[PDB]
Amino acid sequence: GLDSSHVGVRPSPATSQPTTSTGSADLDSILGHMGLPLGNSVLVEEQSTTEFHSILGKLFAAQGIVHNRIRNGDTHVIVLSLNQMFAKELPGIYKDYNHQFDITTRLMPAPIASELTFIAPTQPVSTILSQIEQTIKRNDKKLIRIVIPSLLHPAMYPPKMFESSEIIGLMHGVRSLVKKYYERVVLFASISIDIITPPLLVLLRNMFDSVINLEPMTEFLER
Amino acid sequence: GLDSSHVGVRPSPATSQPTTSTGSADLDSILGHMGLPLGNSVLVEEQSTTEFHSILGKLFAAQGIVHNRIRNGDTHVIVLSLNQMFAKELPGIYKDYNHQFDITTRLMPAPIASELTFIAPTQPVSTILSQIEQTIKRNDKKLIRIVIPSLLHPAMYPPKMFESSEIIGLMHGVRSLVKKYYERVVLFASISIDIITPPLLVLLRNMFDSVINLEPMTEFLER
Amino acid sequence: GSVQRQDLVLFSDQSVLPAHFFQDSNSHNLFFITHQSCTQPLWMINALVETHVLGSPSSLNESSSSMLPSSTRSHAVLASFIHEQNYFTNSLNKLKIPSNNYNVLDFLSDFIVNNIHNKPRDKILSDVLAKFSAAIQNNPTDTIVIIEQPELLLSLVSGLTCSELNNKFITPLLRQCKVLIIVSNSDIFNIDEYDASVHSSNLQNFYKSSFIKSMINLNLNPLKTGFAKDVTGSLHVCRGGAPIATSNTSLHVVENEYLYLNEKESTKLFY
Amino acid sequence: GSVQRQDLVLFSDQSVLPAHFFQDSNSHNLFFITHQSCTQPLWMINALVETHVLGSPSSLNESSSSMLPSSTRSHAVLASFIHEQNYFTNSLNKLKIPSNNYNVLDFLSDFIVNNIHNKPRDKILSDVLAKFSAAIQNNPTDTIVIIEQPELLLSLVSGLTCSELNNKFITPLLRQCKVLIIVSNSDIFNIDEYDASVHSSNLQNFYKSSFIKSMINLNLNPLKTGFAKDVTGSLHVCRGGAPIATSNTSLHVVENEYLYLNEKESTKLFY
Amino acid sequence: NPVILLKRILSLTESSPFILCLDSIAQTSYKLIQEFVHQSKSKGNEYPIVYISFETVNKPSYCTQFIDATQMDFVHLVKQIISYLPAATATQAKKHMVIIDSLNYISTEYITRFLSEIASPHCTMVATYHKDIKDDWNNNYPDKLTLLQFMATTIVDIDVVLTGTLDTEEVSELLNEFRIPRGLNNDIFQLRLVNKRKSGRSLEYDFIVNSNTHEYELLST
Amino acid sequence: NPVILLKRILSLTESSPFILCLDSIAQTSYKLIQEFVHQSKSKGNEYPIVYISFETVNKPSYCTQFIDATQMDFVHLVKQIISYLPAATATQAKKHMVIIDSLNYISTEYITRFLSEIASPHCTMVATYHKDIKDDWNNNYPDKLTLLQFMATTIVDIDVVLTGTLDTEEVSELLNEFRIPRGLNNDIFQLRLVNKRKSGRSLEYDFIVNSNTHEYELLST
């Protein structure tokens, strides 16, 4: 469970349910909850021409680190990626539930290994899920942001992971944790649709609570 | 080598080369050699609705047994088939190079194991080729008719034989024997085109010297 | 808006779920239900539970249909491969279905990690099956079984073919219960410019197969043109490929198309 | 009939086979020749042998082309996977090409039984290669190598891919000789209502691959409409995908279309 | 006359060792199968029915043996079937009818063996193959449907009869996307009979069937 | 300006770690490759060229290293390439150009690893992939061409320039059946340059190239 006087949490207009800021002003309103409800997940889909989706990934992450930094707003960001310069590329700033970020300024103090943790997608699915569980369990009472900066990037995800039982097993298992700790966990993922076959994309979409398509940034959503 | 006063052999109008009767009056003229030149092969292709092609197969075989039966006309027929009632279904009759057969009368005396020999297509390719070689070699000085009554009939040819290296290896190896004993060997094969994929049919045709298509019986040929 | 509501009718005896499918000695019937991602099936699942346990789907229909003269030991086993148990218990409680009338089997929570990972195909299928056997063997003759998204097994279990899924799980499951409802997501058929890939032809076979075995098929689809406020989608009722198993040859599926509005609280049907 | 004959010309120096491809220190050139089943390539093969060994293709051309002032140790290695040795020796003798000028390698006779059957992929490719090495190493700098239907290996050797065939046989073979002629049967492209199967996409890659590596491509095709008496087919001369390997950047392929009549005795070209 | 023939195949009077029923989602084969049973009883020929089930979970009333094949391996399946039939060499036994509810469940490489093993003078096989369920040598080996049509001595191609606006083409296009229209799977339907005579000359006729009044009519196409 | 850019990529002045050349039977890439070499020497940047060959049997005059890759296993290939290049960590070394004659010969599951292994601040890779040579997870894994276009920092799509009656569509249809028309593989040809900028915003222009007079012109399409 979490804290009531948590600044990163707030009830959605549409529902009684606790939600959190995507770190993206506009995006929050479009979701329909003025944010992403705890225990839910979004998949953001983008065309090849980068990198508006890696931007929303970084906003989502940055929003969580600021929360962690002064009541309270304790959060822990988990990143499933091989690129650790994701943590150094997060935007800086400028209730206290959403902030206006600046894509040109980095974050004032660099994120510490205790504020943010990386997990490599170059591992077995069993291992990845274990890490995410274990990280969630030891940061008990902390709000938990899971960010998957670009699902199935071929430079980060081994060919064998593209087998259905691997990637969908991974997504099923992550979805299982999101619902299991619905009290405080949330998931953001992005994916480039040019390297995913339509069947697999259909499978993927089914593991997420909401799916957002970006065409250049205009957002057509599937709630 | 063979005998010159052999009644089943005769020089073709088109060439100096020794040829033999298909056992089918009309078919001989269409081939363009008044028969099938020794050291050559025909593949007869037919649509599903049987069995005009199994008829020409039987004529071809019958023609050889009659030759064997009174100078001379020694021949040996080799049948690649699981149906041994092929030998009992051969038509009866009515220089002495071609005969007019009657599809309703069987052959007067039944063919003996020394006049005709069966080989099963339910064996490894190595084995089949060995049998055919060995049969050819021990009937030295006999004209040799190889008949393959229906190439790739699924009831006679194991699934694994439909792999290219098996069936085309078989056909390459048989073609090799036909050219090796061009002195006295000839090959007739039929096939039903409804159970052969076009790629495989293209491979098959390439192993034969001539290919005959039957549309109901009208014969469009590829010399 | 102020639309003219219709009651759901699936069979010619005017019912949604004829109670006589349940006391019979030897019969097995399959509903196959298909939906797209944008048209969630929960309101349908809960309506069927409600109809079986309380005699009529109060959440869908204005009036009540003919029911049994006394309360039975009617029971529902709900299983999902895509939603956790909270998802059903929360909506069933909101709907006021008493807890003793149903049992939820959760094949999302820790399912990959505990039940799939270090475990061969047969063993996975055999142990999923076994969970259903145990649960059914409590009111075996009076239990409805509802399974959401079993197709997921074709994606989650490496090298599982449609025929193995049917032979080792679906068909044996149908043999142990009176009524089986399969709820399946049909998005794989709905990709613009896409038909018949190998993993997806294996997947598509499952839908054709389930339809062939089903005596009734219900399909939820979104508006073909776009998304609206006070219109959710359409509901088609069709014959399946199998005959209805009863000693009542007059009984038939009443084919129909409805429009429906799935509101937060209630759902309504209208022509 | 009484048609107006043309001489075959392939290059801009007016030749069919420039002799200067042969004494060079470091160059390798590939002709890729394609034919359909109804248009046999033998007359082309024999013409190339004749041109290399005797200076001009007397069987095709009326007049002679510029040649070397003295007889060389010009040699041809002819290899086939579809015809036995008698097939070439009989036609070469009829053509009066002296026997000492060529060597036939027979990969039809007993080839499956002796060389493929109890024998792994690499070993098969390695021992075919070795036959060519031995034969070439007699006039290594002055030998033309002609190979009929190497694609057959893609069908005869279980699980042979185009890339292995190139890497382990074709490309190494091209490295050991001055001029390589590949003669290939293109029927696989000529099936009405048929394109791009897996075994055949592997097969088709070989044609695209050979063309890419070739500096010249000759194609024999039948009449597009049917079969005639005094017309056999057409002969197209095209650039390949590779540059010609010479210190003579002016040299180019002279693209052309001919009609030809392949008569028993002689063959004739005509526009 | 052609209606007489179809009635002769359905009653098992016109012997045909392997009868292939092709069906689809639009019109499954169970009604056609009940015509065989009906015409059999009707025209005096009441044969023992051995029913092989891969997807039939309710045992039909008309069968005398019922084999649940879902759990069985191929050879074990064959052994069960065989033990319920007469010795292929008896020369004095009752004719049995073997019904297989779906051939889609048998591996393509075992189809011909299966057919060869069950074949018996004292036995006729009616098996259905679903046209719309999709399946080193597999590449060149014929697909299940081409194979089965080649092996069959009789073929019965079942189609829906359309009472509405759409024809059978537009409907197969709808089914390809799993869009199920109303008015499929009717008591009245149609079929295309292919019968392979002793010459090889194959007959072919279309029929409207009324599984309610067991009455058939030729189709003047 | 756009012609200036293309001249900057071809001279290796506008750095781009992976340059993908797409070609076909209609117009192979060797001429384009000689433009890189020409513009390199020309605009002062004379870099050491390491040439990887799967199908190039005549060693190009312009290369300083030549690797025959046909006989080599993947890891062994990588080790050769790597030993001819500067230490990825040197901070003071000459820039090398690596040319791979055809990526079609590298397994799809090794493509990203290969690119990752050769990548180096002191190295630019120009590799060609033939558009018309065709290739448990393979099903879902992207095909070689989709993959390579995704990994490339620059793409150069080469096409034939048609002087005759046919356009590039009808010609690709002819080539599909291996019907080779006259007038392919010319000294003048065209290309479509895709360049991926730092924002992700990708540029895209078409050009006519004259490999005889090393002169390029934008294409007003």
Question: What single string gives the DSSP state of each residue in F30-67?
Answer: HHHHHHHHHHHHHTT----EEEEESS--S--TT-SEEE
| Alpha helices, DSSP H, located in D21-95 | 42-54, 85-94
Per DSSP, A110 falls in state P
Give resolution, Å, one decimal.
2.6
DSSP 3-state assignment of E165? coil
Chains touching B by CB (3 or more pairs below 8 Å): D, E
Per DSSP, D189 falls in state G
With the CA atoms of A206, A212, A213 and A218 taken in that order, what torsion angle do they form, in degrees rounded to the nearest 10?
A: 170
Instruction: Inspect the interface and report whether the beta carbons of B180 and D110 lie closer than 8 Å.
Output: yes
E135 touches B: beta carbon within 8 Å: no
DSSP 3-state assignment of E152? coil
F184 close to F27: Cβ distance less than 8 angstroms: yes
Q: Using CA atoms, how far apart are residues E150 and F70, in angstroms rounded to an integer?
A: 46
Other C-beta atoms within 10 Å of E57: how many? 23
Instruction: Inspect the interface and report whether the beta carbons of C156 and A169 lie closer than 8 Å.
Output: yes
Task: Count how many Cα atoms sit within 13 Å of the Cα of residue C63 in the half-sphere of its side chain.
Answer: 8
Q: Using CA atoms, how far apart are residues A45 and A201, in angstroms rounded to an integer?
A: 10
Instruction: Inspect the interface and report whether the beta carbons of D211 and F54 lie closer than 8 Å.
Output: no
Q: For residue F132, which of F27, F20, F33 has the smallest C-alpha distance?
A: F27
Q: Using CA atoms, how far apart are residues C45 and A221, in angstroms rounded to an integer?
A: 26
Residues of E in contact with B162 (CB under 8 A): 137, 140-141
Q: Rounded to an integer, what is the distance from CA D51 to the centroid of its chain?
A: 13
Instruction: Inspect the interface and report whether the beta carbons of E134 and C195 lie closer than 8 Å.
Output: no
With 0-12 CB in 10 A as exposed, 13-18 as middle and 19+ as buried, what is E110? Answer: middle
Instruction: Inspect the interface and report whether the beta carbons of E141 and B49 lie closer than 8 Å.
Output: no
Q: Rounded to an integer, what is the distance from CA F31 to the centroid of its chain?
A: 11
Q: For residue C208, which of E69, E172, E21, E188 has the smallest C-alpha distance?
A: E172
Residues of F in contact with A167 (CB under 8 A): 140
Task: Count how many Cα atoms sit within 13 Å of the Cα of residue A34 in the half-sphere of its side chain.
Answer: 14
Residues of F in contact with C158 (CB under 8 A): 136
Paired with F191 in beta bridges are: F158, F207
Which domains are assigned to chain C? 1-271 (3.40.50.300)
Q: For residue A211, which of A189, A195, A194 has the smallest C-alpha distance?
A: A189
Widest pairwise Cα distance in chain D: 55
Per DSSP, E123 falls in state E
Which amino acid, one-letter code, is at B62? Answer: A
Q: Using CA atoms, how far apart are residues C170 and C210, in angstroms rounded to an integer?
A: 9
Interface of D with E in 130-169 (CB under 8 A): 158-159
Probe site for chain A from C152, C156, C158 (most A CB atoms < 10 A): C156
D165 touches B: beta carbon within 8 Å: no
- Quote the tokens at residue D202: 């592997």
Instruction: Inspect the interface and report whether the beta carbons of E136 and D159 lie closer than 8 Å.
Output: yes
Interface of D with E in 196-225 (CB under 8 A): 197-199
DSSP 3-state assignment of C12? coil
Sequence-separated (6 or more) residues with CB below 8 Å from residue C120 = none
Chains D and E touch (3+ CB pairs under 8 A): yes
Chains A and C touch (3+ CB pairs under 8 A): yes
Peptide bond into A51 cis (omega under 30): yes
Sequence-separated (6 or more) residues with CB below 8 Å from residue F204 = F192, F193, F194, F195
Sequence-separated (6 or more) residues with CB below 8 Å from residue F203 = F5, F193, F194, F195, F197
DSSP 3-state assignment of D218? strand
Tell me phi and psi for residue D201, to 5 degrees: -75, -30
Other C-beta atoms within 10 Å of A140: how many? 11
Sequence-separated (6 or more) residues with CB below 8 Å from residue C166 = C206, C209, E54, E55, E70
The structural domains of chain A, with segments of one domain joined by +, span 1-223
Q: For residue D258, which of D57, D3, D6, D4 has the smallest C-alpha distance?
A: D6
Sequence-separated (6 or more) residues with CB below 8 Å from residue E183 = C255, E160, E162, E163, E164
Q: Using CA atoms, how far apart are residues A92 and D218, in angstroms rounded to an integer?
A: 66
DSSP 3-state assignment of E37? helix
Residues of B in contact with D265 (CB under 8 A): none
Paired with F154 in beta bridges are: F19, F195
Probe site for chain A from C109, C113, C119 (most A CB atoms < 10 A): C113
| Gaps in chain D with C–N over 2.5 Å, residue before each | none
Which amino acid, one-letter code, is at B24? Answer: S
Long-range contacts, stretch E63-66, CB < 8 angstroms, 24+ apart: E63/E99
CA distance A66 to chain F (A): 25
Other C-beta atoms within 10 Å of E46: how many? 12
- Quote the tokens at residue E184: 């499929």
The structural domains of chain F, with segments of one domain joined by +, span 1-221
Nearest CA in chain F to A55: F199
Q: Using CA atoms, how far apart are residues E205 and E2, in angstroms rounded to an integer?
A: 8
* Angle at C76 (CA atoms; ends C72, C78), nearest 5 degrees: 175
DSSP 3-state assignment of D177? coil
Task: Provide the b/e sequence for D183-208 (b: ≥16 CB within 10 Å).
Answer: bbbbbbbbbeeeeebebbbbbbbbbb
Residues of D in contact with B205 (CB under 8 A): 37, 187
**Sheet strands (E) in chain B:** 9-11, 18-20, 36-37, 41-46, 75-80, 91-93, 101-106, 116-119, 143-151, 185-192, 210-215, 218-222
Nearest to E200 among B50, B155, B197 (CB): B50
C56 close to C64: Cβ distance less than 8 angstroms: yes
Probe site for chain A from C80, C87, C155 (most A CB atoms < 10 A): C155
Task: Count how many Cα atoms sit within 13 Å of the Cα of residue A62 in the half-sphere of its side chain.
Answer: 28
Q: Using CA atoms, how far apart are residues C222 and C229, in angstroms rounded to an integer?
A: 12
CA distances from E8 to E12, E62, F131 (A): 6, 19, 59
CA distance A182 to chain F (A): 31
Task: Provide the b/e sequence for F124-161 (b: ≥16 CB within 10 Å).
Answer: bbbbbbbbbbbeebeebbbebbbbbbbbbbbbbbbbbb
CA distance C183 to chain F (A): 26
CA dihedral over C60, C63, C66, C71, signed as positive or negative = positive
CA distance F186 to chain D (A): 9
Which amino acid, one-letter code, is at D46? Answer: N
F9 close to F195: Cβ distance less than 8 angstroms: yes
Residues of B in contact with E139 (CB under 8 A): 163, 197
Q: Using CA atoms, how far apart are residues E53 and E71, in angstroms rounded to an integer?
A: 10
Q: Using CA atoms, how far apart are residues C200 and A198, in angstroms rounded to an integer?
A: 10
Q: Establish, for the pair of chains A and F, how many residue pairs have beta carbons separated by less than 8 Å.
A: 50
With 0-12 CB in 10 A as exposed, 13-18 as middle and 19+ as buried, what is D69? Answer: exposed
Residues of A in contact with F137 (CB under 8 A): 159-163, 166
A48 touches F: beta carbon within 8 Å: yes
Mutual angle of helices E30-42 and E2-10, in 10-degree steps: 90
Mutual angle of helices D42-54 and D85-94, in 10-degree steps: 60
Nearest CA in chain F to D28: F58
Residues of D in contact with F58 (CB under 8 A): 26-28, 245
Tell me phi and psi for residue E213, to 5 degrees: -110, 20
Q: Using CA atoms, how far apart are residues A59 and A99, in angstroms rounded to an integer?
A: 10
- Quote the tokens at residue E200: 């090889």
Nearest to E137 among B159, B194, B199 (CB): B159
Residues of B in contact with D106 (CB under 8 A): none
* Angle at D115 (CA atoms; ends D113, D117), nearest 5 degrees: 55
CA distances from D102 to B180, C179, D105 (A): 21, 81, 10
- Quote the tokens at residue C83: 């939603």
Which amino acid, one-letter code, is at C215? Answer: M
F141 touches A: beta carbon within 8 Å: yes
DSSP 3-state assignment of B20? strand
Domain made up of B1-223: CATH architecture: 3-Layer(aba) Sandwich (3.40)
F contact set with D (CB within 8 A): 25, 28, 30, 54-55, 57-59, 70-71, 104-105, 130, 132-134, 176-185
CATH number of the E1-221 domain: 3.40.50.300
CA dihedral over A30, A15, C37, A163, signed as positive or negative = positive
Chains touching D by CB (3 or more pairs below 8 Å): B, E, F
B176 touches D: beta carbon within 8 Å: yes
Chains C and D touch (3+ CB pairs under 8 A): no
Q: For residue E57, which of C180, C254, F184 has the smallest C-alpha distance?
A: C180
Tell me phi and psi for residue D28, to 5 degrees: -135, 125
Q: Using CA atoms, how far apart are residues D128 and D131, in angstroms rounded to an integer?
A: 5
DSSP 3-state assignment of A28? helix
Q: Using CA atoms, how far apart are residues F200 and F202, in angstroms rounded to an integer?
A: 6
Mutual angle of helices F111-118 and F74-84, in 10-degree steps: 20
Other C-beta atoms within 10 Å of B52: how many? 19
Q: Using CA atoms, how far apart are residues A118 and A76, in angstroms rounded to an integer?
A: 11
CA distance E91 to chain C (A): 37
Nearest CA in chain D to F175: D208
B127 touches D: beta carbon within 8 Å: no
E202 touches B: beta carbon within 8 Å: yes
Q: Using CA atoms, how far apart are residues B4 and B10, in angstroms rounded to an integer?
A: 9
Q: Using CA atoms, how far apart are residues E197 and E155, in angstroms rounded to an integer?
A: 12
Probe site for chain A from F140, F148, F194, F201 (most A CB atoms < 10 A): F140
- Quote the tokens at residue A61: 């992450």
- Quote the tokens at residue C227: 């998304």
Q: Using CA atoms, how far apart are residues E178 and C186, in angstroms rounded to an integer?
A: 8
Q: Using CA atoms, how far apart are residues A134 and A127, in angstroms rounded to an integer?
A: 10
Question: Could you write out the three-class secondary structure of E56-116?
Answer: CCCCCCCCCEEEECCCCCHHHHHHHHHHHCCCCCCCCCCCEEEEECCHHHCCHHHHHHHHH
Q: Using CA atoms, how far apart are residues B132 and A161, in angstroms rounded to an integer?
A: 51
Nearest CA in chain C to E56: C213
Chains B and C touch (3+ CB pairs under 8 A): no
Other C-beta atoms within 10 Å of E172: how many? 17
Residues of B in contact with D110 (CB under 8 A): 176, 180
E144 close to E10: Cβ distance less than 8 angstroms: no
Sequence-separated (6 or more) residues with CB below 8 Å from residue D114 = none
D24 close to D178: Cβ distance less than 8 angstroms: yes
Q: For residue E28, which of E128, E164, E146 has the smallest C-alpha distance?
A: E128
Q: Using CA atoms, how far apart are residues D66 and B208, in angstroms rounded to an integer?
A: 41
E65 close to E52: Cβ distance less than 8 angstroms: no
